[PDB]
Amino acid sequence: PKVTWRLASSFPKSLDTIFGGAEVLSKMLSEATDGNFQIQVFSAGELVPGLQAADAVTEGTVECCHTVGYYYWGKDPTFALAAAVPFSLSARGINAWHYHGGGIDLYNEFLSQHNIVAFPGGNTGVQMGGWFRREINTVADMQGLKMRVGGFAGKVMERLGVVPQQIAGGDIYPALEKGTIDATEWVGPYDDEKLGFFKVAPYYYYPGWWEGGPTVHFMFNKSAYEGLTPTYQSLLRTACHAADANMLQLYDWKNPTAIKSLVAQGTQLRPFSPEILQACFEAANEVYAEMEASNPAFKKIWDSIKAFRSEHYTWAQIAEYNYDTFMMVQQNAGKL
Amino acid sequence: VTWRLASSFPKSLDTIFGGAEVLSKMLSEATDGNFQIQVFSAGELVPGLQAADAVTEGTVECCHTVGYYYWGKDPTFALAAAVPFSLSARGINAWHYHGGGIDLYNEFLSQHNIVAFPGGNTGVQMGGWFRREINTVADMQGLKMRVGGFAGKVMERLGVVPQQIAGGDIYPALEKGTIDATEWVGPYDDEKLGFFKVAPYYYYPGWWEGGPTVHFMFNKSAYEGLTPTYQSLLRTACHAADANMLQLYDWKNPTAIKSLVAQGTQLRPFSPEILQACFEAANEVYAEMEASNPAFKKIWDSIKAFRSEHYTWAQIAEYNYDTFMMVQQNAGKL
């Protein structure tokens, strides 16, 4: 049957892989229905501002959006849990929980009151730790750090004396160039290379512990979703599931070429030290303790994630870790 | 559209066999029953190991199988499924969907009347169940192991003597001491066989299968006779089902390994010496195949081109993040 919807993306077209997930979903649905199930994609600001995409869905302004749940953490930190919070699961672990651990239903139980039904719509994999003008090696090096970063990541780092900066995307490069900020988040090698941060902030840190496996949800107006035939509800879920895998796979394909290119252009890769990672982890757990004690919805979902998190990281160190470690050791020896 | 799908798998291998049921449900629901793929377990339509042969010959429209089952016909069949020391699941999927891998494999399969798309991944498989521990290459000399395919060919060069044993006859063989070890799959499936009762040393990793994909293979004429609409729907649903199986294993395996250890299973890593020896032996086998088989060389070279890039990048953000979480788990901090 003919369905004609609008999708408001939180993302600009220049974030091609993330924005592209909505295009992929739209194409999947159109093609599978000989053009009948139409979702017209719009990029950030075209219909509504990117950070208000979910609000538009709730209000019935548009039928759906493609967004990251953590954009709405200010309304309720529970929005962040199924997207990404610091020191959560990486992509395969979160996906196991989403699809087979009851995570999609748990998140939808929370979202019902907000007039939304959501399904995973991509994963970026572990993000990078950002672009730095000067090295940081110790916790003390973080004192008074001016970093363009926000949300959860920012809340955690504030416990360690960093002050998050609010700066428009296009204003970051000149701020780094002038020395007005010390560091910036962005995404990962494929997206970051285009911004040329390496020219003015050469140290590229990792891992972005605030986003170990962030899911980019498709969120649907609850009335609109419920009005679909069972056939289209099923197709929609199938297509979201495929699109979700597709984005991760695209990043997994593109990122290796991009990191090589960045290093070839003089980028200085640097791990966050064990001391820094341990401090950030401790700070994050302090924040979660407060939230769990004050917010029952948050506690329910986070306890569910944590239950699987310990099991996942027990198993992952057996076959997966040992296989991959062996391959990496071969690679470092020039043997691949 | 009413099609029959011959599975290579028995229903008791529920998560692998189940992939076909998942695809069938996705297609039926999305079309209100108009695109019906009827799923048959191993031996119901044709013998399980002849599933792709039946597709090639057009006796059935499609199958759900593992490419390396047909490595006897041409070792190229195995490459997009799993060969030793290839990519793990995210790496191979990157190559499949965005590295031209699906197209490269289909270019090979065209002569065999098949169009194939990934239909699941199991993630890294285990190294098998052993009556006695092994630590060195010397320890492998004369080892009677139930294993075949590439893995058997490689280990044979190191002195193991591969055994050809039906799934159902493995437990009794271990019980009676007629064999020393067996491979099977991983914790979820392996637990159901109760190998910990007779051969409790559970080795890892199964380096022969880092990220095995289980393909749907469709008769090319059958596929080309679908409307472009159903062709596209079929690709979308395969892509979803492929993710679904990996996600099921990633969910189930943590529970199974805990249960196995609780019941006395002794986890043991293959030593650096053993792994390196297997890696060198595998490269020797590849060098032989590449020199004699242009089709094999073309696809393997493509996988290897990405393999080195992948293992450069994966060791940065992904490995550092995950290893930090593992350390925290081990410290009781999660």
XYZ file of C-alpha atoms in Angstrom:
670
model
C 0.000 0.000 0.000
C 1.034 3.621 -0.509
C 2.644 5.214 2.544
C 4.290 8.606 2.251
C 6.398 9.744 5.249
C 9.065 12.343 6.098
C 12.224 11.580 8.058
C 14.047 14.392 9.830
C 17.745 13.530 10.240
C 19.780 14.885 13.164
C 22.756 14.846 10.763
C 24.211 17.027 8.002
C 24.873 15.367 4.644
C 28.613 15.955 5.164
C 28.504 13.195 7.815
C 27.868 10.900 4.872
C 28.052 7.498 6.542
C 25.792 8.379 9.488
C 23.400 10.572 7.490
C 23.525 7.869 4.791
C 21.847 5.288 7.070
C 18.483 7.004 6.551
C 19.065 6.959 2.753
C 19.827 3.248 2.974
C 16.646 2.580 4.956
C 14.598 4.690 2.498
C 16.041 2.797 -0.520
C 15.476 -0.598 1.136
C 11.819 0.179 1.821
C 11.065 1.759 -1.575
C 12.737 -1.068 -3.498
C 11.048 -3.838 -1.439
C 7.610 -2.314 -2.175
C 7.974 -1.244 -5.828
C 7.993 2.406 -4.640
C 4.880 2.185 -2.429
C 6.491 2.623 1.032
C 8.083 6.061 0.652
C 10.134 7.750 3.367
C 11.586 11.042 2.146
C 14.830 11.808 3.966
C 15.757 15.360 4.968
C 19.101 16.355 6.479
C 19.626 18.404 9.664
C 17.869 21.804 9.648
C 15.905 21.149 6.438
C 12.645 20.477 8.296
C 13.681 21.086 11.925
C 17.001 21.646 13.741
C 19.046 18.418 14.066
C 18.944 18.389 17.865
C 15.136 18.659 17.802
C 14.507 15.735 15.444
C 13.020 13.464 18.150
C 10.841 16.345 19.453
C 9.349 16.669 15.925
C 8.557 12.939 15.974
C 6.923 13.067 19.426
C 4.785 16.021 18.316
C 3.771 14.341 15.019
C 5.433 17.082 12.894
C 7.274 14.303 11.008
C 6.654 10.541 11.097
C 10.235 9.626 11.940
C 13.817 10.686 12.521
C 17.343 9.245 12.482
C 19.182 10.471 15.588
C 21.347 9.520 18.590
C 19.446 8.922 21.835
C 22.074 10.708 23.925
C 21.133 14.052 22.306
C 18.104 13.965 24.666
C 19.955 12.993 27.871
C 19.084 16.439 29.318
C 15.399 15.524 29.277
C 16.196 12.144 30.872
C 19.596 10.342 30.939
C 17.647 7.127 30.121
C 17.486 8.301 26.482
C 21.277 7.829 26.312
C 21.417 4.188 27.492
C 20.439 2.381 24.271
C 22.539 4.806 22.194
C 25.769 5.074 24.152
C 26.938 5.909 27.630
C 30.604 5.835 28.813
C 32.124 2.386 29.343
C 29.172 0.461 27.916
C 29.303 -2.380 25.375
C 31.032 -2.217 22.003
C 29.054 -2.811 18.799
C 28.634 -6.621 18.776
C 27.853 -6.661 22.528
C 25.247 -3.884 22.402
C 23.644 -5.499 19.300
C 23.364 -8.847 21.087
C 21.523 -7.052 23.905
C 19.351 -5.003 21.499
C 18.148 -7.884 19.350
C 18.259 -10.908 21.673
C 18.621 -9.547 25.200
C 15.280 -7.702 25.225
C 16.997 -4.305 24.818
C 14.804 -3.077 21.930
C 11.653 -3.805 24.009
C 13.142 -2.246 27.171
C 14.007 0.961 25.314
C 10.556 0.998 23.685
C 8.877 0.525 27.075
C 10.622 3.729 28.134
C 9.930 5.569 24.861
C 6.163 4.801 24.804
C 5.366 7.784 27.067
C 7.305 9.943 24.576
C 5.126 8.754 21.656
C 8.023 6.963 19.945
C 8.781 3.429 18.777
C 12.492 3.057 17.953
C 14.796 0.501 16.336
C 18.590 0.502 15.905
C 19.634 2.295 12.723
C 23.424 2.019 12.665
C 26.532 1.722 14.799
C 29.767 3.649 14.319
C 31.892 1.249 16.387
C 34.323 2.681 18.962
C 34.862 6.357 18.301
C 38.252 8.090 18.558
C 39.293 10.165 21.602
C 39.669 13.461 19.697
C 42.233 15.947 18.347
C 44.681 17.573 20.788
C 47.081 20.511 20.338
C 49.344 19.171 23.122
C 49.821 15.721 24.619
C 48.108 14.529 27.772
C 49.777 11.739 29.701
C 48.578 11.985 33.301
C 45.323 12.803 35.092
C 46.989 16.066 36.204
C 47.519 16.990 32.507
C 43.677 17.243 32.212
C 43.441 20.129 34.721
C 41.661 23.075 33.039
C 41.552 21.314 29.641
C 39.272 23.191 27.254
C 37.703 20.456 25.144
C 34.882 20.690 22.613
C 32.754 17.833 23.902
C 29.368 17.640 25.646
C 26.717 15.314 27.020
C 27.687 12.371 29.145
C 31.299 12.478 28.069
C 31.454 16.071 29.313
C 29.719 15.305 32.593
C 32.260 12.584 33.334
C 35.290 14.699 32.392
C 34.057 17.621 34.497
C 34.838 15.436 37.564
C 38.444 15.529 36.357
C 38.663 19.314 35.845
C 38.059 19.536 32.111
C 35.690 22.257 30.979
C 33.532 21.264 28.007
C 33.306 23.971 25.330
C 30.192 24.700 23.242
C 31.395 25.505 19.707
C 29.705 25.278 16.318
C 31.282 22.649 14.033
C 32.646 25.256 11.603
C 34.249 27.265 14.421
C 36.390 24.430 15.859
C 39.297 24.564 13.385
C 39.968 28.315 13.840
C 39.653 27.892 17.649
C 42.274 25.124 17.577
C 44.380 27.187 15.168
C 44.244 30.186 17.556
C 44.796 28.073 20.717
C 41.446 29.133 22.178
C 40.560 25.497 22.888
C 42.909 22.600 23.576
C 41.070 19.655 22.029
C 37.957 18.557 20.175
C 35.832 15.453 19.759
C 34.550 14.544 16.340
C 33.930 10.924 15.237
C 36.678 8.700 13.778
C 39.266 8.540 11.016
C 36.935 8.488 8.002
C 34.881 11.574 9.074
C 37.682 13.434 10.859
C 40.120 13.470 7.956
C 37.841 15.805 5.983
C 38.019 18.475 8.734
C 41.852 18.723 8.617
C 42.192 18.946 12.408
C 45.534 17.151 12.073
C 46.974 20.447 10.726
C 46.340 22.372 13.965
C 45.935 19.626 16.577
C 48.257 16.725 15.560
C 47.728 14.328 18.446
C 44.851 11.934 17.780
C 43.798 10.160 20.969
C 42.014 6.856 21.500
C 39.763 5.241 22.540
C 36.693 7.505 22.753
C 35.575 5.681 25.951
C 32.351 7.692 25.986
C 31.177 5.926 22.807
C 32.312 2.317 22.656
C 29.494 1.143 20.353
C 27.001 3.897 19.745
C 23.702 2.999 18.126
C 22.036 5.601 15.871
C 18.286 4.971 16.224
C 15.451 5.291 13.774
C 12.626 6.725 15.911
C 9.041 6.509 14.675
C 5.982 8.373 15.810
C 4.028 5.787 17.802
C 0.697 6.571 16.115
C 2.326 6.404 12.654
C 4.032 3.089 13.401
C 0.874 1.568 14.900
C -1.141 2.691 11.820
C 1.044 0.620 9.494
C -0.152 -2.794 8.333
C 1.546 -5.764 10.146
C 3.273 -6.426 6.803
C 4.870 -2.953 6.757
C 5.689 -3.056 10.489
C 7.589 -6.291 9.884
C 9.299 -4.964 6.744
C 10.240 -1.766 8.592
C 11.917 -3.790 11.406
C 13.704 -6.023 8.864
C 14.988 -3.003 6.927
C 16.138 -1.197 10.112
C 18.004 -4.385 11.135
C 19.808 -4.538 7.766
C 20.513 -0.792 7.686
C 21.896 -1.042 11.241
C 24.417 -3.705 10.174
C 25.170 -1.791 6.951
C 26.460 1.362 8.672
C 28.802 -0.569 10.975
C 30.149 -2.532 8.007
C 30.700 0.642 5.991
C 32.764 2.201 8.803
C 34.662 -1.067 9.259
C 35.517 -0.926 5.518
C 36.402 2.809 5.284
C 38.150 3.525 8.576
C 41.307 1.438 7.890
C 42.089 3.430 4.717
C 41.363 6.745 6.483
C 43.623 6.041 9.505
C 46.488 5.141 7.165
C 45.936 8.354 5.221
C 45.883 10.461 8.409
C 49.150 8.937 9.637
C 50.713 9.483 6.172
C 49.768 13.201 6.544
C 51.626 13.489 9.897
C 48.919 12.575 12.459
C 50.365 11.482 15.842
C 48.311 8.601 17.233
C 48.306 8.466 21.050
C 46.484 6.178 23.484
C 44.891 7.655 26.575
C 47.164 6.288 29.328
C 45.940 3.590 31.782
C 45.914 6.301 34.521
C 43.577 8.525 32.436
C 41.259 5.682 31.398
C 41.056 4.432 34.996
C 40.181 7.931 36.301
C 37.470 8.388 33.619
C 36.017 4.942 34.469
C 35.916 5.773 38.192
C 34.265 9.147 37.487
C 31.685 7.506 35.194
C 30.761 4.960 37.867
C 30.275 7.792 40.395
C 27.870 9.487 37.972
C 25.968 6.210 37.318
C 25.570 5.592 41.090
C 23.844 8.967 41.442
C 21.601 8.352 38.446
C 20.645 4.806 39.515
C 19.673 6.075 42.990
C 17.472 8.883 41.622
C 15.995 7.554 38.356
C 14.192 4.165 38.328
C 13.819 4.092 34.503
C 17.580 4.629 34.118
C 18.403 1.986 36.720
C 16.185 -0.640 35.049
C 17.830 -0.278 31.624
C 21.383 0.246 32.900
C 21.212 -2.779 35.234
C 20.070 -4.840 32.237
C 22.983 -3.605 30.112
C 25.448 -4.167 32.986
C 24.163 -7.720 33.542
C 25.139 -8.591 29.989
C 28.233 -6.371 29.996
C 30.105 -8.577 32.524
C 29.064 -11.817 30.714
C 30.052 -10.373 27.324
C 33.488 -9.246 28.481
C 34.037 -12.633 30.139
C 33.370 -14.510 26.874
C 34.978 -11.995 24.495
C 38.398 -12.570 26.057
C 38.377 -16.238 25.046
C 37.971 -17.019 21.328
C 37.502 -13.494 19.888
C 40.303 -11.766 21.823
C 42.795 -14.582 21.281
C 42.114 -14.933 17.567
C 42.277 -11.183 16.930
C 45.382 -10.737 19.129
C 47.193 -13.429 17.169
C 46.317 -11.675 13.869
C 47.430 -8.287 15.175
C 50.745 -9.770 16.324
C 51.189 -11.208 12.782
C 50.330 -7.800 11.297
C 52.816 -5.954 13.509
C 55.494 -8.426 12.402
C 54.812 -7.751 8.703
C 53.557 -11.351 8.317
C 50.130 -10.646 6.764
C 6.523 -17.184 -5.260
C 6.844 -20.617 -3.625
C 10.409 -21.866 -3.202
C 12.014 -24.807 -1.383
C 15.205 -24.286 0.622
C 17.474 -27.260 1.385
C 19.424 -26.653 4.595
C 22.826 -28.269 5.129
C 21.932 -28.305 8.855
C 19.870 -30.475 11.218
C 17.230 -28.660 13.337
C 19.281 -29.536 16.438
C 21.895 -26.981 15.331
C 19.152 -24.539 16.063
C 20.874 -21.188 15.651
C 22.564 -22.078 12.346
C 19.601 -24.004 10.939
C 17.331 -21.236 12.369
C 18.858 -18.612 10.036
C 16.800 -20.079 7.184
C 13.619 -19.897 9.299
C 14.463 -16.275 10.114
C 14.866 -15.401 6.433
C 11.643 -17.276 5.551
C 9.687 -15.367 8.261
C 11.109 -11.991 7.207
C 10.084 -12.606 3.590
C 6.609 -14.035 4.362
C 5.736 -11.251 6.788
C 7.004 -8.467 4.506
C 4.882 -9.741 1.584
C 1.787 -10.998 3.424
C 2.674 -14.609 2.433
C 3.322 -13.930 -1.259
C 7.062 -14.750 -1.134
C 7.124 -18.148 0.536
C 10.377 -20.014 1.104
C 9.648 -23.440 2.612
C 12.552 -24.563 4.814
C 13.743 -28.191 4.946
C 16.368 -29.546 7.332
C 19.369 -31.632 6.245
C 18.381 -34.849 4.446
C 14.697 -33.999 3.994
C 15.001 -32.804 0.379
C 18.588 -33.753 -0.462
C 21.551 -34.822 1.718
C 22.903 -31.850 3.741
C 26.355 -31.849 2.189
C 24.773 -31.863 -1.304
C 22.633 -28.780 -0.751
C 24.594 -26.395 -3.057
C 24.926 -29.191 -5.679
C 21.149 -29.445 -5.761
C 20.944 -25.661 -6.239
C 23.541 -25.752 -9.055
C 21.513 -28.494 -10.785
C 18.167 -26.713 -10.209
C 16.583 -29.594 -8.264
C 15.843 -27.088 -5.495
C 15.722 -23.248 -5.726
C 17.968 -22.419 -2.794
C 20.010 -23.619 0.148
C 21.556 -22.418 3.406
C 25.038 -23.868 3.688
C 28.717 -23.230 4.394
C 30.876 -22.633 1.305
C 33.798 -24.684 2.595
C 31.665 -27.869 2.376
C 32.426 -27.704 -1.374
C 36.173 -27.061 -1.159
C 36.685 -30.493 -2.778
C 34.984 -29.206 -5.929
C 37.116 -25.991 -5.858
C 38.921 -24.491 -2.821
C 37.588 -21.083 -3.941
C 34.192 -22.113 -2.456
C 35.698 -21.828 1.038
C 37.132 -18.318 0.722
C 34.000 -16.248 1.393
C 32.849 -18.772 4.026
C 36.004 -19.294 6.141
C 39.615 -20.299 5.552
C 42.310 -20.484 8.279
C 43.655 -17.142 9.573
C 41.195 -15.018 7.625
C 39.103 -12.098 8.970
C 36.892 -12.228 12.052
C 33.183 -11.398 11.699
C 33.219 -7.586 11.468
C 36.246 -7.703 9.126
C 34.750 -10.224 6.726
C 31.391 -8.411 6.726
C 33.109 -5.116 5.852
C 34.684 -6.922 2.875
C 31.427 -8.732 1.898
C 29.166 -5.671 1.880
C 31.491 -2.753 1.078
C 34.716 -4.287 -0.199
C 33.175 -5.924 -3.284
C 33.273 -9.349 -1.655
C 29.670 -10.363 -2.433
C 30.272 -9.464 -6.106
C 33.649 -11.213 -6.258
C 32.167 -14.429 -4.827
C 29.168 -14.239 -7.166
C 31.480 -13.772 -10.147
C 32.997 -17.139 -9.180
C 29.624 -18.745 -8.461
C 28.021 -17.702 -11.772
C 29.534 -20.732 -13.571
C 27.951 -22.889 -10.839
C 24.476 -21.349 -11.360
C 24.431 -19.713 -7.916
C 23.827 -16.207 -6.609
C 24.780 -16.141 -2.920
C 24.459 -13.641 -0.092
C 25.753 -13.936 3.476
C 23.211 -15.723 5.705
C 24.801 -15.581 9.157
C 28.114 -15.545 11.001
C 29.029 -17.620 14.069
C 31.999 -15.459 15.201
C 35.265 -17.143 16.158
C 34.671 -20.863 16.748
C 36.390 -22.869 19.500
C 39.498 -25.075 19.066
C 37.761 -28.291 20.095
C 37.539 -30.796 22.935
C 40.593 -32.793 23.973
C 41.074 -35.848 26.241
C 44.642 -34.697 27.056
C 46.287 -31.293 26.972
C 48.646 -30.277 24.170
C 51.355 -27.581 24.327
C 53.857 -28.052 21.483
C 54.012 -29.101 17.848
C 55.652 -32.343 19.056
C 52.497 -33.016 21.133
C 50.458 -32.968 17.911
C 52.325 -35.848 16.249
C 49.871 -38.696 15.714
C 46.988 -36.775 17.301
C 43.727 -38.409 16.192
C 41.378 -35.431 15.786
C 37.906 -35.289 14.299
C 38.454 -32.417 11.895
C 38.370 -31.959 8.158
C 38.617 -29.479 5.318
C 41.323 -26.859 5.333
C 41.851 -27.208 9.058
C 42.568 -30.925 8.615
C 44.845 -30.333 5.635
C 46.918 -27.800 7.589
C 47.146 -29.869 10.767
C 48.025 -32.954 8.720
C 51.232 -31.169 7.653
C 52.073 -30.866 11.338
C 51.577 -34.573 12.055
C 47.953 -34.814 13.244
C 45.880 -37.586 11.721
C 42.412 -36.219 10.827
C 39.418 -38.434 11.536
C 36.224 -38.550 9.455
C 33.364 -39.099 11.903
C 29.620 -38.450 11.736
C 28.374 -35.906 14.313
C 26.522 -38.656 16.211
C 29.521 -40.995 16.420
C 31.923 -38.419 17.947
C 30.913 -38.768 21.609
C 31.207 -42.601 21.592
C 34.648 -42.359 19.880
C 35.925 -39.991 22.613
C 34.271 -42.179 25.265
C 36.005 -45.326 23.949
C 39.274 -43.431 23.338
C 39.273 -44.177 19.594
C 40.083 -40.505 18.967
C 41.992 -37.885 20.988
C 39.995 -34.741 20.172
C 37.155 -33.232 18.133
C 36.102 -29.875 16.801
C 32.432 -28.971 16.672
C 31.323 -25.330 16.881
C 31.443 -23.121 20.016
C 30.079 -23.042 23.588
C 26.377 -22.807 22.751
C 26.220 -25.806 20.397
C 29.052 -27.772 22.021
C 27.416 -27.797 25.459
C 24.488 -29.875 24.131
C 26.871 -32.718 23.203
C 28.279 -33.100 26.746
C 31.919 -33.443 25.608
C 33.024 -32.173 29.067
C 32.070 -35.671 30.378
C 34.773 -37.374 28.295
C 37.176 -34.737 26.901
C 37.061 -31.653 29.138
C 40.058 -29.653 27.819
C 38.395 -27.005 25.637
C 40.910 -25.273 23.373
C 40.765 -21.875 21.683
C 40.764 -20.152 19.250
C 39.516 -22.306 16.355
C 41.977 -20.507 14.037
C 40.448 -22.340 11.056
C 37.257 -20.337 11.541
C 37.771 -16.735 12.644
C 34.487 -15.410 11.278
C 32.669 -18.020 9.203
C 29.763 -16.900 7.091
C 26.928 -19.260 6.355
C 25.577 -18.388 2.910
C 22.160 -18.459 1.404
C 22.753 -19.721 -2.131
C 20.030 -19.231 -4.749
C 19.756 -20.801 -8.152
C 20.828 -17.980 -10.509
C 17.956 -18.545 -12.925
C 15.471 -18.649 -9.981
C 16.905 -15.412 -8.577
C 16.859 -13.659 -11.965
C 13.192 -14.712 -12.429
C 12.137 -12.755 -9.326
C 10.821 -9.227 -9.842
C 13.410 -6.498 -9.117
C 11.218 -5.764 -6.060
C 11.592 -9.314 -4.667
C 15.303 -9.386 -5.618
C 15.870 -6.302 -3.492
C 13.686 -7.564 -0.647
C 15.641 -10.845 -0.723
C 18.995 -9.011 -0.420
C 17.682 -6.814 2.437
C 16.278 -9.805 4.351
C 19.516 -11.817 3.863
C 21.483 -8.811 5.197
C 19.231 -8.654 8.298
C 19.297 -12.432 8.841
C 23.098 -12.415 8.517
C 23.362 -9.869 11.338
C 20.705 -11.702 13.349
C 22.653 -14.978 13.588
C 25.882 -13.297 14.733
C 23.879 -11.335 17.330
C 22.211 -14.553 18.568
C 25.573 -16.251 19.041
C 26.999 -13.152 20.760
C 24.008 -13.260 23.144
C 23.996 -17.060 23.789
C 27.724 -17.874 23.945
C 28.441 -15.918 27.171
C 25.749 -17.957 28.993
C 26.965 -21.293 27.532
C 30.638 -20.746 28.392
C 29.708 -19.926 32.001
C 27.549 -23.075 32.227
C 30.359 -25.188 30.682
C 32.987 -23.887 33.128
C 30.537 -24.325 36.025
C 30.287 -28.001 35.056
C 34.054 -28.600 35.011
C 35.134 -27.554 31.506
C 38.878 -26.674 31.442
C 39.549 -23.788 29.062
C 43.048 -23.930 27.468
C 44.635 -21.598 24.868
C 46.574 -23.109 21.956
C 50.200 -22.115 22.629
C 52.033 -19.434 20.594
C 54.188 -22.275 19.160
C 51.139 -24.235 17.969
C 49.385 -21.181 16.523
C 52.491 -19.970 14.687
C 53.134 -23.467 13.267
C 49.515 -23.647 12.024
C 49.839 -20.176 10.470
C 53.048 -21.096 8.600
C 51.511 -24.426 7.410
C 48.377 -22.608 6.221
C 50.458 -20.095 4.208
C 52.237 -23.005 2.525
C 48.853 -24.495 1.549
C 47.636 -21.089 0.220
C 50.826 -20.634 -1.835
C 50.137 -23.997 -3.526
C 46.494 -23.138 -4.282
C 47.284 -19.634 -5.552
C 49.898 -20.957 -7.999
C 47.451 -23.461 -9.520
C 44.068 -21.740 -9.200
C 43.541 -18.173 -10.627
C 39.987 -17.944 -9.201
C 41.267 -18.771 -5.723
C 44.166 -16.337 -6.086
C 41.884 -13.482 -7.150
C 39.553 -13.756 -4.160
C 42.224 -14.589 -1.566
C 44.388 -11.672 -2.706
C 41.355 -9.400 -2.262
C 40.702 -10.711 1.276
C 44.399 -10.406 2.170
C 44.546 -6.814 0.863
C 41.897 -5.851 3.420
C 43.056 -8.267 6.141
C 46.275 -6.315 6.809
C 44.433 -2.925 6.789
C 41.731 -4.268 9.108
C 44.191 -5.663 11.633
C 46.066 -2.329 11.595
C 42.891 -0.324 12.395
C 41.144 -2.795 14.734
C 44.118 -2.665 17.084
C 43.578 1.063 17.745
C 40.145 2.149 19.012
C 38.377 -1.221 19.068
C 41.114 -3.274 20.790
C 42.098 -0.621 23.293
C 38.504 -0.070 24.372
C 37.587 -3.754 24.610
C 40.836 -4.734 26.365
C 40.284 -2.024 28.979
C 36.777 -3.467 29.643
C 38.217 -6.998 29.901
C 40.808 -5.832 32.455
C 37.992 -4.215 34.495
C 35.945 -7.426 34.280
C 38.914 -9.466 35.527
C 39.396 -6.993 38.404
C 35.750 -7.487 39.438
C 35.122 -3.828 38.607
C 32.187 -4.302 36.205
